[PDB]
Write a protein that binds this ligand. Structure first.
Ligand SMILES: NS(=O)(=O)c1ccc2[nH]c(=O)oc2c1
Length: 209
């Protein structure tokens, strides 16, 4: 059972701007996704401060980076609060309509794409390097769902029958053919140290066979 949705016009606009603007500093996508993960981990930690059973779905609060050269995928896994199906459909828990509005006025006021995170829509910077993005997520109050979009104005949502997650969010970046440098260990290490040195959760860079 696969449901296909149309992006709001403003989100489709943001997404094609990210895809079509000439902008060489693509590495900031990883900063933005790790920062998104850190925010989601902050949310579940805060909830657990008064209700410890909120961590029954997983006590470890961490971020994993998983490159797969055979699949040409970079996966960012976090054990944060996750997203409901409603969150997924509602622009993955963001206020993307007003955020895109503010982001695009800033761009004409001198800003560049690297500042996308200050407007709450940093997730969509994934399309700087990915031709397709799959988001697997599990929230304590909902089932496991899979969101997917290759841009083009639509996304799909289905119940995820894959590996049970426990709690959190998994962002699978199906990388563009010329963007495989972000599968290389030393390149990911460089980016994490440059942009994410003060993230308050363990970031584990998986290695490959
Ligand atoms: N902007 S739209 O009229 O909603 C639209 C139009 C064509 C599409 N093809 C696709 O995959 O998503 C689409 C969304």
């Amino acid at each position: 059972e696969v449901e296909t949705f149309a992006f709001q016009a403003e989100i489709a606009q943001l997404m094609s701007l990210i895809i079509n603007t000439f902008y060489s500093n693509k590495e900031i996508f990883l900063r933005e996704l790790i920062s998104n993960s850190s925010d989601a981990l902050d949310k579940i930690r805060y909830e657990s401060l008064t209700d410890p059973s909120k961590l029954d779905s997983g006590k470890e609060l961490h971020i994993n980076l998983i490159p797969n050269k055979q699949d040409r995928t970079l996966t960012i896994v976090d054990t944060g609060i996750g997203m409901t199906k409603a969150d997924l459909i509602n622009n993955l828990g963001t206020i993307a309509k007003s955020g895109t509005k503010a982001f695009m006025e800033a761009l004409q006021a001198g800003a560049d794409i690297s500042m996308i995170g200050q407007f709450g829509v940093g997730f969509y910077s994934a399309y700087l390097v990915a031709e397709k993005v799959t988001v697997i997520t599990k929230h304590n109050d909902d089932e496991q769902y899979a969101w997917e979009s290759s841009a083009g104005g639509s996304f799909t949502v289905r119940t995820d029958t894959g590996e049970p997650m426990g709690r959190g969010t998994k962002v699978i970046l199906h990388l563009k053919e010329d963007q495989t440098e972000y599968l290389e260990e030393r390149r990911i290490k460089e980016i994490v140290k440059k942009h994410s040195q003060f993230i308050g959760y363990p970031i584990t860079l998986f290695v490959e066979k």
